[PDB]
Design a protein around this ligand. Structure first.
Ligand code: BGW
Ligand code: YB
Ligand code: YB
Ligand code: ZN
Length: 608
C-alpha cells in the first residue's frame, strides 16, 4: 500500500533498520546540527538510488563508504517538505545493507521543534527545547523515510551546554563532558526496540527528576517536580494493569516529562519518556486518565502501529479502549461506562463542528493532499472507541473482548498494519461468531461520515446527576434562578462537575442572567482544574458575558494545549465584544507560539 504523506522511497523499495544520531543543540542559532547515519536495507535487486523525506533542512554532505555522494533536493511540496534523492555509489542486491551518513542542520522554524527563551520557562535562567514528531514532523529534524510503515532502532549522542540536561524517547546511556568542548556535555541514548520515526523525541532544558515508582522517574523544571510526583503517583499501578491487559511491557523504563505550558497536546506516547502537558497538574490526580492513555500506547500504537496515517484510528481507538479498562479496573465498571458515555458526547461535538457529511468524520480517512495536523480531532479516538465498545457488547462482554485485544497485540507486535489486517484478524479470532460479525454495517462504521450507525449501551448511574442538574439550568426561567445553591454540587465529583458543564455547553448559549447566577452560586471562576475551567469559560463566552473575556484570553495564552487554546480563540473570535482582542492577541503571541499551534490558530481565526 501507499503512504500518501511521505515523499521517501516506500518500505517495498528499502527499509531503514537503524539510526545513529550525533548532534549538537545551539540555542543561539536555534539549530540542531549533526549527522544522521541511516542503516538502510535494500528490498529490491539492483537498487541505485533512494529518496528520503526532509523539511526545511540544510544538507552539508552525504557520505557512503567514507566518500561523498551525489544528492538532490526536489521542489518543496507544501507541508510534505522536500524529497532528497541520494545516488548510491554501488548498486545493491536484495537484503544488502549500507550505512548512509547525512550531515544536516535544522531551520529555527522547524515544525517539529519549539525553542523557548528563559522568560518562557519556569526557572527564567535557562532556555529550553522540545520536539513533537507525530504525525510527519520527524522530517523537520532529520532526513528519514518519515512513514509509520518503517520501524527502526536508534542510538544517539547529543551535545548540549553543560548546565542543561538532554532526554530522548530511549534508555539513558550515560553522560560525559564533551571531549570537543568543555563548556558542553554529551548525553547518550539507546532505543533497542524498533519504532516508527514519529516516536523519536528530544528535550533539552534545566531538568530535575524524582523517582515515583520502580521503573518511573518524573522529569520537569525544579518548580514542578514536587507537584508532578504527587499528581502521577498512580503510574506504577496503571502500568501493572496495562501489563495484565496487553502483555509484557517491553520498553524497560516508563518515565514522564512534564513540559512547559506551550506543549500542544495532552500527552505524547514517546517510548521510555511520555511527554505531558502541565495542564494535568490539577492537584487531586483527577486528570490521570491522560497517563493511562499514554501507558496504553506502549502496546497499541508503539508495538502495533498504523501502516499509514489513514489508519490512525487503529492507534487511538484501541488505546482509548485499553485506557478506559485501566480506569475501570481502578475505579469500577460504572466509572468505565461514565467515561465511555462522556466519549460519545465528545464524538457528537466533533461531528457537529465538522458537519455530519465531512470526510474527517470518517473512521478511515484519505489523507492524500491533507496535512494530518489539519485532519486531527476526537473522531479516531471516539468513533474508534465506539466501534470497539459496540463489538465488545455484540461479542459477549469485556472479558471476551479483552482476550481478543491481547491476541491482537501479540499477533501484530513490532509490525505496522491497516484496517483490513485488523478486520481479518478480528474475523479469524471470532470465527465462531462470524454470523454476529456479518451483522455489523462495516461500510458505515469504517468509511461513512457522521455519527456511527449504532450507539452502544451505557450504564447511566454516574451520568444521571449531571444530566439532571444540566436540565434544571436549561429549563430554568428567571423566577427559578433563586432555587440554585452551592448545595447542588455537594455530591458531584470533579469528573461529574466537568460532565455537568459539558452537557450544558452542548445547549449553549444560555441566557446571560443564568450564567451570572451560576458564578454567584457555584463560584466556577475559582476552579483551577484546566478541563472544568475551559468548559466554564467557553460557556461564559458563548453566553456573551464580557467579564469572561480577560479570563478566556489569559487561559488561551498562558498555556498552549490545542484542545483548550483553539476552541477558546475560536469562541473569542465569534463574540463581537472580543473579536478584535482575539485577533490582536494571536498576532502579538504568534512569534512565541509552538509552530503547529500558531499555524492552526491562524487558520481557525482566518489570519494569515
Ligand atoms: O496521545 C495522543 O494521541 C496525542 C499525541 C500527539 N498527537 C499529534 C497528531 C497530529 C496529527 C495526527 O494526524 C492524524 N490525524 C488524523 C485524524 C483522523 C484520521 C487520521 C488522522 S492522522 C495524529 C497525531 C495526537 C494527540
Ligand atoms: Yb550502557
Ligand atoms: Yb416560573
Ligand atoms: Zn493517543
Amino acid at each position: 500500500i501507499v503512504d500518501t504523506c511521505s515523499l521517501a522511497s516506500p518500505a517495498s523499495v528499502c527499509r531503514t533498520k537503524h539510526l545513529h544520531l550525533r548532534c549538537s543543540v545551539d540555542f543561539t542559532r536555534r539549530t540542531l546540527t549533526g549527522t544522521a547515519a541511516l542503516t538502510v536495507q535494500s528490498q529490491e535487486d539492483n537498487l541505485r538510488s533512494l529518496v528520503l523525506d526532509t523539511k526545511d533542512l540544510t544538507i552539508e554532505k552525504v557520505v557512503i563508504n567514507g566518500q561523498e555522494v551525489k544528492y538532490a533536493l526536489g521542489e518543496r511540496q507544501s507541508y510534505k517538505g522536500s524529497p532528497m534523492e541520494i545516488s548510491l555509489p554501488i548498486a545493491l542486491s536484495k537484503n544488502q545493507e549500507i550505512v548512509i551518513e547525512i550531515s544536516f542542520e535544522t531551520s529555527p522554524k522547524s515544525s517539529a521543534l519549539q525553542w523557548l527563551t528563559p522568560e518562557q520557562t519556569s526557572g527564567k535562567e535557562h532556555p529550553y527545547l522540545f520536539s513533537q514528531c507525530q504525525a510527519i514532523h520527524c522530517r523537520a529534524i532529520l532526513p528519514c523515510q518519515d512513514t509509520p510503515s518503517v520501524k527502526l532502532t536508534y542510538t544517539a549522542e547529543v551535545s548540549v551546554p553543560k548546565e542543561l540536561v538532554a532526554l530522548m524517547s530511549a534508555i539513558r546511556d550515560g553522560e560525559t563532558p564533551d571531549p570537543e568542548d568543555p563548556s558542553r556535555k554529551i548525553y547518550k541514548f539507546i532505543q533497542k526496540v524498533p519504532i516508527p520515526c514519529y516516536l523519536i523525541a528530544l528535550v533539552v532544558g534545566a531538568l530535575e527528576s524524582r523517582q515515583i515508582g520502580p521503573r518511573t522517574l518524573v522529569w520537569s523544571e525544579k518548580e514542578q517536580v514536587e507537584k508532578s510526583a504527587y499528581e502521577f503517583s498512580e503510574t506504577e499501578s496503571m502500568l501493572k494493569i496495562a501489563e495484565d491487559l496487553g502483555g509484557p511491557y517491553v520498553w524497560g523504563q516508563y518515565d514522564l516529562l512534564v513540559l512547559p505550558p506551550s506543549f500542544p497536546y495532552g500527552g505524547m506516547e514517546n517510548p521510555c519518556l511520555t511527554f505531558v502537558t502541565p495542564t494535568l497538574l490539577a492537584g487531586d490526580k483527577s486528570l490521570s486518565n491522560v497517563i493511562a492513555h499514554e501507558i496504553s500506547h506502549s502496546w497499541t500504537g508503539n508495538l502495533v502501529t498504523n501502516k499509514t496515517w489513514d489508519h490512525f484510528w487503529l492507534n487511538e481507538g484501541h488505546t482509548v479502549y485499553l485506557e478506559r479498562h485501566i480506569c475501570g479496573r481502578l475505579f469500577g465498571e460504572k466509572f468505565r461506562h461514565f467515561n465511555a458515555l462522556g466519549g460519545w458526547g465528545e464524538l457528537q461535538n466533533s461531528v457537529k463542528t465538522f458537519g455530519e457529511t465531512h470526510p474527517f468524520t470518517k473512521l478511515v480517512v484519505d489523507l492524500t493532499d491533507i496535512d494530518p495536523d489539519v485532519a486531527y480531532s476526537s473522531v479516531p479516538y471516539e468513533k474508534g472507541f465506539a466501534l470497539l465498545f459496540y463489538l465488545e457488547q455484540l461479542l459477549g462482554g469485556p472479558e471476551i473482548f479483552l482476550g481478543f485485544l491481547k491476541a491482537y497485540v501479540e499477533k501484530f507486535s513490532y509490525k505496522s498494519i491497516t484496517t483490513d489486517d485488523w478486520k481479518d484478524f478480528l474475523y479469524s479470532y471470532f470465527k465462531d461468531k462470524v454470523d454476529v460479525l456479518n451483522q455489523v454495517d462495516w461500510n458505515a462504521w469504517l468509511y461513512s461520515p457522521g455519527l456511527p450507525p449504532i450507539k452502544p449501551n451505557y450504564d447511566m448511574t454516574l451520568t444521571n446527576a449531571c444530566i439532571a442538574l444540566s436540565q434544571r439550568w436549561i429549563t430554568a426561567k428567571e423566577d427559578d434562578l433563586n432555587s440554585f445553591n452551592a448545595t447542588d454540587l455537594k455530591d458531584l465529583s470533579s469528573h461529574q462537575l466537568n460532565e455537568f458543564l459539558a452537557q450544558t455547553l452542548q445547549r449553549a448559549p444560555l441566557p446571560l442572567g443564568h450564567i451570572k447566577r451560576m458564578q454567584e452560586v457555584y463560584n466556577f471562576n475559582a476552579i483551577n482544574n484546566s478541563e472544568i475551567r475551559f468548559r466554564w469559560l467557553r460557556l461564559c463566552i458563548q453566553s456573551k458575558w464580557e467579564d469572561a473575556i480577560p479570563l478566556a484570553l489569559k487561559m488561551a495564552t498562558e498555556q498552549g494545549r490545542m484542545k483548550f487554546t483553539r476552541p477558546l480563540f475560536k469562541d473569542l473570535a465569534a463574540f463581537d465584544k472580543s473579536h478584535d482582542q482575539a485577533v490582536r492577541t494571536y498576532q502579538e503571541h504568534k512569534a512565541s507560539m509552538h509552530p503547529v499551534t500558531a499555524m492552526l490558530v491562524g487558520k481557525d481565526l482566518k489570519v494569515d
